[PDB]
């Protein structure tokens, strides 16, 4: 129905603002199929204008944007795309014939087998985490399982000129809408609504921020250093 398409379009805008044209155009193609079956011309026009916007699309940074999309009949589609300096270097998509993280930049074709086998293990864990979190959220908002639902994650770091961390990030959106985010101190959380306040109490009491801080400050920055050098040439 119309409400399902609006959620998809909100998810398109979140993907655009996060910097992932790949999940963005996957989402908006689902919106276009949906809005053709409903026949609402206002809706059709919204989808088309977001389509145009995607057509019409120093400091250093690394981002992985992850997306789970639950559709009418089953399992949700899980996507993850990594960016260095706003350019795609890796990608995973559960709808592929043998899902696995694959290099998207030429300077990434030098990493050995052990690299990709462990990245693919993380994506496989993430997909199960995303499908469990999608169920939890359905109950939090007492929503219908038959509707379309999306869950979006952005994590990464920005670096200054001496290549030191200026900001780590880890934020979530639910159906295109801001849900919870690690604060810039990497120790406290900002929750947007009362559902997200449940998640917040949970994550504070189990010390989840310490786990993500360790990543942002360690492997995230250290492996960005290696990619930037690998891309220097």
């Amino acid at each position: 129905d119309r409400e399902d398409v609006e959620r998809l379009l909100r998810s398109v805008e979140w993907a655009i603002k996060a910097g992932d044209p790949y999940s963005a155009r996957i989402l908006v193609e689902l919106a276009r199929e949906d809005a053709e079956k409903i026949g609402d011309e206002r809706l059709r026009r919204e989808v088309e204008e977001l389509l145009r916007e995607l057509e019409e699309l120093g400091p250093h940074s690394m981002k992985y944007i992850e997306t789970a999309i639950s559709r009418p009949g089953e399992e949700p589609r899980y996507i993850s795309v990594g960016y260095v300096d706003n350019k795609e270097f890796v990608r995973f998509d559960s709808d592929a014939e043998n899902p696995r993280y694959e290099p998207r930049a030429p300077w990434m074709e030098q990493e050995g087998p052990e690299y990709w086998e462990r990245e693919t293990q993380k994506a496989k864990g993430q997909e199960q985490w995303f499908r469990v979190s999608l169920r939890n959220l359905l109950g939090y908002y007492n929503q219908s399982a038959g509707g379309s639902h999306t869950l979006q994650q952005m994590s990464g770091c920005d670096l200054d000129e001496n290549w030191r961390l200026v900001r780590g990030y880890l934020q979530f959106a639910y159906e295109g809408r801001d849900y919870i985010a690690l604060n810039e101190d990497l120790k406290t959380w900002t929750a947007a609504d009362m559902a997200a306040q449940i998640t917040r109490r949970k994550w504070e009491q189990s010390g989840a921020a310490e786990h993500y801080k360790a990543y942002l400050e360690g492997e995230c920055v250290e492996w960005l250093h290696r990619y930037l050098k690998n891309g220097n040439a």
């Binding site: 994506a123 864990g125 993430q126 985490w129 189990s206 993500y212």
Partner: peptide, 9 residues
């Protein structure tokens, strides 16, 4: 290298 999430929502 990608993060891996801990506690679910």
């Amino acid at each position: 290298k990608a993060v891996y999430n801990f506690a679910t929502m």
